[PDB]
Amino acid sequence: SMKIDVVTIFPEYLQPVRQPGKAIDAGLVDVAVHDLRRWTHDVHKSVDDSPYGGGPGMVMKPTVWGDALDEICTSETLLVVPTPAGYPFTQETAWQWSTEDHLVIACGRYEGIDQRVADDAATRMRVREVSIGDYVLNGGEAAALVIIEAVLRLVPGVSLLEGPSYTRPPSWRGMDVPPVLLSGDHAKIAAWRAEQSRQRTIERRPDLLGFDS
Amino acid sequence: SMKIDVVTIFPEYLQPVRQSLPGKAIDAGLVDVAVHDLRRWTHDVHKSVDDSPYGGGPGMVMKPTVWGDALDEICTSETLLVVPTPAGYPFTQETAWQWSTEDHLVIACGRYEGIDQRVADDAATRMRVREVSIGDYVLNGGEAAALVIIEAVLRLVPGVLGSLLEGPSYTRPPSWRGMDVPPVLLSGDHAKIAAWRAEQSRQRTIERRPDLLG
Ligand SMILES: NC(=O)c1ccc2[nH]ccc2c1
Ligand SMILES: NC(=O)c1ccc2[nH]ccc2c1
């Protein structure tokens, strides 16, 4: 069983998590979404301020985050902070996190979260700053959705690129399913599929096989 | 001015990003995101979208006749057809920049073990097709990848927003739970601040992303 808390200033953006939806329905995992502004005290509910040292944009204040995480996290929590400057989130990471009791995902907006939030949390719990890929999102919420989906499907009770797949009809718009796939010859099918995967990995992801680019 | 059509068997997944678009950008006709239920193009009363894989194996494959009809209706010769797949080329910020100038993106969201390959192969004979992965992890389907792609692309579209890793950022208060903001940031020596940030970036990139440094 796993508990996931997501903290965000846009809780409505996390609704796609209800599809993970079937997983929540079957009660293996519970996912709860929290509005960060719940932990503000001024009437303007401010969560951001200009950066020390200058630069464009705003930084999320540590005070509000600290109060939220104080309430939501325990010492057993794995605190996950999406950020383009994070360690890479990979399938290995997803396997690792799949056996955790409690994930808390802190979703940043603006130019990021004051670094002391993660630093303070790390004195009490395990903290993981991670990137889901080399592109810029408008905030951590889409990353949270990717992480949740990748992790939940590995929870107990829920190399080379995959080649092309085919299903019926065997001829469509004058394009035939590769004949070997209709042959029923398991050895020849396995071989053809390995060759397809090789071509595809070399072409699209040569890095996976230890080649440049 | 970009139109994005997304085709999926879970259209509700994409509704929050649809509603997150700034009214001003929609009012100015800079952007439109439309989401379509793939089952609109099914042929049978059971609204079947998948079938068993030729050659055997686990899971199911999405039917080419259904996808073929959907894309026939939605795509034109000017369309850039995006197909999220773990077997794709990597989607990066460079990709997002390239696609941000397109008039029409169509994102085909697959489930199970993928879409019959003839769908993309046939589409590629009359439009540009891009199979892409958003990272090295497995999702249940393409919807979360579509969300990522839509966000990354649209924030580059002129209007809709109205190397090395970045280092740490700080804001008020100057002291918090025993941790001080690095005094250099308060120094008013902006050449020194820039050099400090550069070194923080170098150290963080070495620690977290050595791949970025050859
Ligand atoms: N690529 C990422 O993982 C990423 C990019 C931008 C972001 N902004 C807030 C969180 C976040 C994550
Ligand atoms: N990592 C990806 O981009 C990814 C993983 C699994 C998927 N299933 C369907 C589309 C898709 C994309």
Q: Is the peptide bond before A156 cis (omega within 30 degrees of 0)?
A: no
Find, in chain B, the residue whose alpha carbon is nearest to that of A123.
B177
Token digits of residue A146: 């990717």
Q: Which domains does chain A have, with CATH numbers?
A: 2-153 (3.40.1280.10)
The dihedral formed by the CA atoms of B19, A18, A166 and B126, expressed in degrees to the nearest 10: 0
In this complex, the residue of A16, A94, A175 whose CB is nearest that of residue B16 is A16
Method: X-ray
Ligand 2 within 6 A of B29 CB? Answer: no
Q: How far apart are CA A197 and CA A199, in angstroms?
A: 6
Q: Is the peptide bond before A169 cis (omega within 30 degrees of 0)?
A: yes
Contact A180/B at CB under 8 A = yes
B117: closest CA of chain A, how far (Å): 6
What residues in B contact A145, CB-CB < 8 Å?
144, 147
Q: Do B61 and A111 touch (CB under 8 A)?
A: no
Q: How far apart are CA A213 and CA A88, in angstroms?
A: 18
Q: What type of residue sits at position B39? A: R
In this complex, the residue of B19, B96, B170 whose CB is nearest that of residue A52 is B170
B191: closest CA of chain A, how far (Å): 11
